[PDB]
Amino acid sequence: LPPGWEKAMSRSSGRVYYFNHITNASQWERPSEPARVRCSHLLVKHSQSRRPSSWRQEKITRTKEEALELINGYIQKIKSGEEDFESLASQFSDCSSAKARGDLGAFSRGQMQKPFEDASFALRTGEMSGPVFTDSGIHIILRTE
Numbered sequence: 001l002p003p004g005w006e007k008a009m010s011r012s013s014g015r016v017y018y019f020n021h022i023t024n025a026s027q028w029e030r031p032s033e034p035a036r037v038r039c040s041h042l043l044v045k046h047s048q049s050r051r052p053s054s055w056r057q058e059k060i061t062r063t064k065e066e067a068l069e070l071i072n073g074y075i076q077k078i079k080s081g082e083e084d085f086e087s088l089a090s091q092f093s094d095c096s097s098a099k100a101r102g103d104l105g106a107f108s109r110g111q112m113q114k115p116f117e118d119a120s121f122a123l124r125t126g127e128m129s130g131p132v133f134t135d136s137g138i139h140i141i142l143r144t145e
């Protein structure tokens with residue numbers, strides 16, 4: 001029961017799963033702080049983002065709900081192995097880090113928006129977040145170191 005994990009019950013099936021309210025990750029297995037972490041991410045922006053513009057699109061007009069649908073489809077494809085994270089980040093992330101497969105490099109606490117930072121620090125090395133909302137949009141975060 002590491003930082004932020006609770007036990008839940010599948011609504012489809014009734015099987016126990018685990019949910020992390022800091023990262024928004026969910027998994028079937030029962031789960032499991034450093035000075036610095038390294039993360040990649042895939043950002044989907046929406047009309048209410050801080051800067052509603054990206055290399056992909058001059059004026060981003062999608063709604064926040066549509067952005068979450070896009071995020072959820074990418075998470076499904078990445079969990080299935082149908083696509084890998086780096087490939088979706090390169091194609092579809094509304095962040096300039098798309099050119100680097102979503103990689104942001106290493107950072108310590110005190111640098112990123114707080115929901116992004118908290119989720120980064122609560123992920124285990126190799127672990128991926130669920131949807132993480134910041135003023136910039138919705139993020140899928142992969143902790144790489």
Ligand SMILES: Cn1nc(-c2ccccc2)cc1C(=O)N[C@H](Cc1ccc2ccccc2c1)C(=O)O
Binds near residue numbers: 096104116117
């Ligand atoms: C930080 N950073 N690193 C890069 C980068 C790295 C490698 C190669 C090229 C670009 C781009 C950015 C950045 O600020 N990107 C922002 C989106 C962003 C990202 C990390 C966020 C992290 C937390 C909260 C909001 C964020 C919001 C943008 O492009 O609008």
